[PDB]
Every structure is written in C-alpha cells, then in structure tokens.
C-alpha cells in the first residue's frame, strides 16, 4: 500500500481496529487492512471487514 492511500482511511486496520504503519496490502474496493488480519479474515469471511464486498 501507499502512504497517501493509508492516510486517506485513517491507515487503521478495521479488522482489529488498531493501526497500519507498515506491512499491509490494499483491496480493489479502497480498503487497506493488515496482511495478517486479511488472510485470516477471508479464511472465515469471504467479505471485506468493512464493505463486506466480495473481493476474492
Ligand atoms: Zn488488523
Ligand atoms: Zn472493501
């Protein structure tokens, strides 16, 4: 992800509602989340942790 896109969304991972300073990806829906929270989130819920919009 980029610093401009992260700041455009509080650069905070919703999944755990913490913070994202480095080590995360960006979804095609405009929602960045921890690279660990995602792979683990989709493993149970195939929907964005915010927009729950099919991505996989
Ligand atoms: Zn997280
Ligand atoms: Zn989304």
Curated annotation (Swiss-Prot):
This is E3 ubiquitin-protein ligase synoviolin. A zinc finger (RING-type) spans 13-52. E3 ubiquitin-protein ligase which accepts ubiquitin specifically from endoplasmic reticulum-associated UBC7 E2 ligase and transfers it to substrates, promoting their degradation. Component of the endoplasmic reticulum quality control (ERQC) system also called ER-associated degradation (ERAD) involved in ubiquitin-dependent degradation of misfolded endoplasmic reticulum proteins. Also promotes the degradation of normal but naturally short-lived proteins such as SGK. Protects cells from ER stress-induced apoptosis. Zn(2+) 2 binds at residues 29, 31, 48, 51. Induction: By endoplasmic reticulum stress-inducing agents such as thapsigargin, tunicamycin or brefeldin A, but not by heat shock. It is found in: Endoplasmic reticulum membrane. Homodimer. Interacts with p53/TP53. Interacts with HTT. Component of the HRD1 complex, which comprises at least SYNV1/HRD1, DERL1/2, FAM8A1, HERPUD1/HERP, OS9, SEL1L and UBE2J1. FAM8A1 is stabilized by interaction with SYNV1, which prevents its proteasomal degradation. OS9 and UBE2J1 recruitment to the complex may be mediated by SEL1L. SYNV1 assembles with SEL1L and FAM8A1 through its transmembrane domains, but interaction with its cytoplasmic domain is required to confer stability to FAM8A1 and enhance recruitment of HERPUD1. Belongs to the HRD1 family. It is linked to In certain aggressive cases of activated B cell-like diffuse large B-cell lymphoma (ABC-DLBCL), plays a role in the degradation of misfolded N-terminal mutated PRDM1 proteins. Changing residue 51 to S: Abolishes E3 ligase activity. Not N-glycosylated. Auto-ubiquitinated. Deubiquitinated by USP19. Ubiquitously expressed, with highest levels in liver and kidney (at protein level). Up-regulated in synovial tissues from patients with rheumatoid arthritis (at protein level). The RING-type zinc finger is required for E3 ligase activity. Zn(2+) 1 binds at residues 13, 16, 34, 37.
């Amino acid at each position: 992800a980029t610093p401009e896109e992260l700041q455009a969304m509080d650069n905070v991972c919703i999944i755990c509602r913490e913070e994202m300073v480095t080590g995360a990806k960006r979804l095609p829906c405009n929602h960045i989340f921890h690279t660990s929270c995602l792979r683990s989130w989709f493993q149970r819920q195939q929907t964005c942790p915010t927009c729950r919009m099919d991505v996989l």
